[PDB]
């Protein structure tokens, strides 16, 4: 099991649409304890995004339907999906805490993995109750904030990762904390700082930075009303 072998496996898995495999491959790769390359890193993240992304979508479907006598079936099912979603997120957080974040040597990746830790705790927050929920919401924000402090020290305002952090962190406020004024504030700031440094935009990724900028604008102009 070369690292090269595992990566081909994952690239195939991806091609085949078996994302539990693609994730298991990258989780294997990650457990060899070397800093992931950018590509290695980007697969793990895509793999896991699709894995959990299917339970999130499924959960929503089952919760939409729940909102129609012996409905304790919707509930017993929801909780199965939820239990499963919690295990995927704990995988990724164990990985982030044990390997990705400590093995991270450089701004671009330190932020990326802290954003991801924010994401996954946010995902847990969607299905969490009581004490658990307060701990989740709070570790989500705490990870988002640490990535942002570092992105502000170390990256252009136009950096896709940094823009992508602002985007996710803004939604964290809107959807999870239910603080829209803050979601907007956090987003106008991130937008305005990017549109100031327009000369910094590199043609070499201009379309990505400008993509996420339009995403940011989207949410604002929706969110104002």
């Amino acid at each position: 099991m070369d690292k090269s072998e595992l990566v081909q496996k994952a690239k195939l898995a991806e091609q085949a649409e078996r994302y539990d495999d693609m994730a298991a491959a990258m989780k294997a790769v990650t457990e060899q304890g070397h800093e992931l390359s950018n590509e290695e890193r980007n697969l793990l993240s895509v793999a896991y995004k699709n894995v959990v992304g299917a339970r999130r979508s499924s959960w929503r479907v089952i919760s939409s339907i729940e909102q129609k006598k012996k409905q304790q079936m919707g509930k017993e099912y929801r909780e199965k999906i939820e239990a499963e979603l919690q295990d995927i997120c704990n995988d990724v957080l164990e990985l982030l805490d044990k390997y990705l974040i400590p093995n991270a040597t450089q701004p671009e990746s330190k932020v990326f993995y802290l954003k991801m830790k924010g994401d996954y705790f946010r995902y847990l927050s969607e299905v969490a109750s009581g004490d658990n929920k307060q701990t989740t919401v709070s570790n989500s924000q705490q990870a988002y904030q640490e990535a942002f402090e570092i992105s502000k020290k170390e990256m252009q305002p136009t950096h896709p990762i940094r823009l992508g952090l602002a985007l996710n962190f803004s939604v964290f406020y809107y959807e999870i904390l239910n603080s829209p004024e803050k979601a907007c504030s956090l987003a106008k700031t991130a937008f305005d700082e990017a549109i100031a440094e327009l000369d910094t935009l590199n043609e070499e990724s201009y379309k990505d930075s400008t993509l996420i900028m339009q995403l940011l604008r989207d949410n604002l102009t929706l969110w104002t009303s």
Binding site: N42, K49, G164, L211
Partner: peptide, 11 residues
């Protein structure tokens, strides 16, 4: 793909 890898909370 970086954009894909960044699972954007989306548009």
């Amino acid at each position: 793909g970086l954009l894909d890898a960044l699972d954007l909370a989306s548009k």
